[PDB]
Paper text:
The dark state of AtPhot2LOV2 absorbs light maximally at λ = 447 nm via its flavin mononucleotide (FMN) chromophore. To determine the structure of the dark state of AtPhot2LOV2, representative of the time series before t = 0 ms, we carried out the same diffraction experiment, but without illumination, on a series of 32 crystals. The first 500 images of 15 data sets could be successfully integrated and were subjected to clustering with ccCluster which retained 5 sub-wedges using a CCthreshold of 0.43 and resulted in a complete highly redundant data set at 2.2 Å resolution. Most residues were modelled in a single conformation A, while ten were modelled with alternate conformations A and B, including Cys426 which forms a covalent bond with the FMN in the light state. The hydro­philic side of the FMN isoalloxazine ring is stabilized by two hydrogen bonds to Asn458 and one key hydrogen bond to Gln489 [Fig. 4(a)].
Phot2 is a high-intensity blue-light photoreceptor mediating phototropism in higher plants. The protein comprises two successive light–oxygen–voltage (LOV) domains (LOV1 and LOV2) separated by the α-helix A′α, and a kinase domain separated from LOV2 by the α-helix Jα [Fig. 1(a)]. In particular, Jα unfolds upon blue-light irradiation, triggering kinase activity. TR-SOX was used to probe the build up of the light state in the photocycle of the LOV2 domain of Phot2 (phototropin-2) from Arabidopsis thaliana (AtPhot2LOV2) with a time resolution of 63 ms.
Author numbering: 387 to 502
Amino acid sequence: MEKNFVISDPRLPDNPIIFASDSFLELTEYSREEILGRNCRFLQGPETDQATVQKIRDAIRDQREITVQLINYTKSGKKFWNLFHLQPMRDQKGELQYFIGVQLDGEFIPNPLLGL
Ligand SMILES: Cc1cc2nc3c(=O)[nH]c(=O)nc-3n(C[C@H](O)[C@H](O)[C@H](O)COP(=O)(O)O)c2cc1C
């Protein structure tokens, strides 16, 4: 099965990526060594809806799962629609341990409907 996903450590400054799947590197055209320890916001760009980024920010604050569709950019500057699913991961004692984010590329919801 193909799966674009990255894993971040919220107990380190600014939620850095500590693991990225091979297909994520394939989709984003980045190498593994140039995104490790990065915040995933580097995928955003001029066309990224800031109102959608705000929804992600609130979901991380409240440590709840969320699904949004937003524009992301590859290393070479190509735009692609990203159906992004974020999920909190807790340990045996109920403490937040990781965030996992899954990316599906494609304009699943038509943008004229997404803008409403
Ligand atoms: C595990 C994880 C994966 C993420 N993946 C993406 C992503 O693929 N694309 C994206 O635009 N933002 C992604 N984000 C969100 C950004 O890292 C960041 O949280 C978002 O831009 C809001 O934070 P900010 O307002 O500080 O920039 C991800 C966040 C986490 C925790």
